[PDB]
Write an enzyme that holds these catalytic residues in place. Structure first.
Site, PDB file in Angstrom:
ATOM      1  N   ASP A  16       0.718  -1.237  -0.147  1.00  0.00           N
ATOM      2  CA  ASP A  16       0.103   0.182  -0.052  1.00  0.00           C
ATOM      3  C   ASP A  16       1.116   1.232   0.067  1.00  0.00           C
ATOM      4  O   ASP A  16       0.170   2.451   0.156  1.00  0.00           O
ATOM      5  CB  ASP A  16      -0.909  -0.035   1.275  1.00  0.00           C
ATOM      6  CG  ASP A  16      -0.114   0.267   2.458  1.00  0.00           C
ATOM      7  OD1 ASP A  16       1.126   0.356   2.686  1.00  0.00           O
ATOM      8  OD2 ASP A  16      -0.925  -0.137   3.608  1.00  0.00           O
ATOM      9  N   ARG A  30       0.890   6.820   0.212  1.00  0.00           N
ATOM     10  CA  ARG A  30       0.192   5.766   0.653  1.00  0.00           C
ATOM     11  C   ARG A  30      -1.166   5.773  -0.392  1.00  0.00           C
ATOM     12  O   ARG A  30      -1.607   6.661  -0.845  1.00  0.00           O
ATOM     13  CB  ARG A  30      -0.477   6.280   1.735  1.00  0.00           C
ATOM     14  CG  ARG A  30      -1.603   5.316   2.523  1.00  0.00           C
ATOM     15  CD  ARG A  30      -1.336   3.959   2.874  1.00  0.00           C
ATOM     16  NE  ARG A  30      -2.190   3.245   3.829  1.00  0.00           N
ATOM     17  CZ  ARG A  30      -3.246   2.531   3.366  1.00  0.00           C
ATOM     18  NH1 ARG A  30      -3.513   2.547   1.878  1.00  0.00           N
ATOM     19  NH2 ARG A  30      -3.983   1.925   4.078  1.00  0.00           N
ATOM     20  N   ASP A  35      -6.753  -1.370   1.736  1.00  0.00           N
ATOM     21  CA  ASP A  35      -6.122  -1.834   2.727  1.00  0.00           C
ATOM     22  C   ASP A  35      -5.653  -3.188   2.182  1.00  0.00           C
ATOM     23  O   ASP A  35      -6.617  -3.904   1.854  1.00  0.00           O
ATOM     24  CB  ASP A  35      -6.959  -1.832   3.852  1.00  0.00           C
ATOM     25  CG  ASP A  35      -7.446  -0.813   4.609  1.00  0.00           C
ATOM     26  OD1 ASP A  35      -6.440   0.190   4.578  1.00  0.00           O
ATOM     27  OD2 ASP A  35      -8.547  -0.716   5.154  1.00  0.00           O
ATOM     28  N   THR A  36      -4.375  -3.268   2.289  1.00  0.00           N
ATOM     29  CA  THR A  36      -3.505  -4.746   1.811  1.00  0.00           C
ATOM     30  C   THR A  36      -3.083  -5.161   3.044  1.00  0.00           C
ATOM     31  O   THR A  36      -2.877  -4.669   4.118  1.00  0.00           O
ATOM     32  CB  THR A  36      -2.342  -4.235   1.112  1.00  0.00           C
ATOM     33  OG1 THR A  36      -1.497  -3.276   1.692  1.00  0.00           O
ATOM     34  CG2 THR A  36      -2.782  -3.925  -0.408  1.00  0.00           C
ATOM     35  N   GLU A  38      -0.556  -6.652   5.554  1.00  0.00           N
ATOM     36  CA  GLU A  38       0.899  -5.842   5.389  1.00  0.00           C
ATOM     37  C   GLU A  38       1.845  -7.081   5.946  1.00  0.00           C
ATOM     38  O   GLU A  38       1.729  -7.861   6.368  1.00  0.00           O
ATOM     39  CB  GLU A  38       0.897  -4.480   6.541  1.00  0.00           C
ATOM     40  CG  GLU A  38      -0.115  -3.477   5.824  1.00  0.00           C
ATOM     41  CD  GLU A  38      -0.295  -2.797   7.122  1.00  0.00           C
ATOM     42  OE1 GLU A  38       0.525  -1.680   7.526  1.00  0.00           O
ATOM     43  OE2 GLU A  38      -1.430  -2.525   7.281  1.00  0.00           O
ATOM     44  N   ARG A  82       2.907  11.093   4.529  1.00  0.00           N
ATOM     45  CA  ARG A  82       2.622  10.485   3.435  1.00  0.00           C
ATOM     46  C   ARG A  82       1.735  10.989   2.420  1.00  0.00           C
ATOM     47  O   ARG A  82       0.376  11.499   2.975  1.00  0.00           O
ATOM     48  CB  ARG A  82       2.210   9.037   3.469  1.00  0.00           C
ATOM     49  CG  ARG A  82       3.101   8.114   4.289  1.00  0.00           C
ATOM     50  CD  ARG A  82       2.666   6.733   4.593  1.00  0.00           C
ATOM     51  NE  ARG A  82       1.476   6.609   5.306  1.00  0.00           N
ATOM     52  CZ  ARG A  82       0.837   5.532   5.531  1.00  0.00           C
ATOM     53  NH1 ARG A  82       1.315   4.270   5.042  1.00  0.00           N
ATOM     54  NH2 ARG A  82      -0.260   5.465   6.386  1.00  0.00           N
TER      55      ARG A  82
END
EC number: 3.1.31.1
Length: 136
Positions: A16, A30, A35-36, A38, A82
């Site tokens: 992400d 970002r 939502d990946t 992690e 980010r």
């Protein structure tokens, strides 16, 4: 109207998060709305499909001719400094590619940074239906 701006890949950090040169400065981005799992999760560390999501983002950005970033209508940076953007590799949205492949879920969304939300929701529903990866 959103518009795309060029960026130069420095390093893919996680599924992400990528580091790029943007307007002559290194900056972390970002990926908006996804939502990946992690590999660098704060508490959890490496989750299932984390390594796969990470490799997918990496290969997609590293093998691209042109990387572009697209800011949404709201805040352009998060609390960590980010950039918050839609990322494109040769015209293909990385945020969408992830969701379509069942390697990301659509995040909790924050108005007004929700322009491609319905587009992403449609891809997630297809990945669910096809039972891909996260959805298998």
């Amino acid at each position: 109207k959103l518009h795309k701006e060029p960026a130069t890949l420095i390093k893919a950090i996680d599924g992400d998060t990528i580091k790029v040169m943007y307007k002559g400065q290194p900056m972390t981005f970002r990926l908006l709305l996804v939502d990946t799992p992690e590999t660098k999760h704060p508490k959890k560390g490496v989750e299932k499909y984390g390594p796969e999501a990470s490799a997918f983002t990496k290969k997609m950005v590293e093998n691209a001719k042109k990387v572009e970033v697209e800011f949404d209508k709201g805040q352009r940076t998060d609390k960590y400094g980010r950039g918050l953007a839609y990322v494109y590799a040769d015209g293909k949205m990385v945020n969408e590619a992830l969701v379509r492949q069942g390697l990301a879920k659509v995040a909790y969304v924050y108005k007004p940074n929700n322009t491609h939300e319905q587009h992403l929701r449609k891809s997630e529903a297809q990945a669910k239906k096809e039972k891909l990866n996260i959805w298998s």
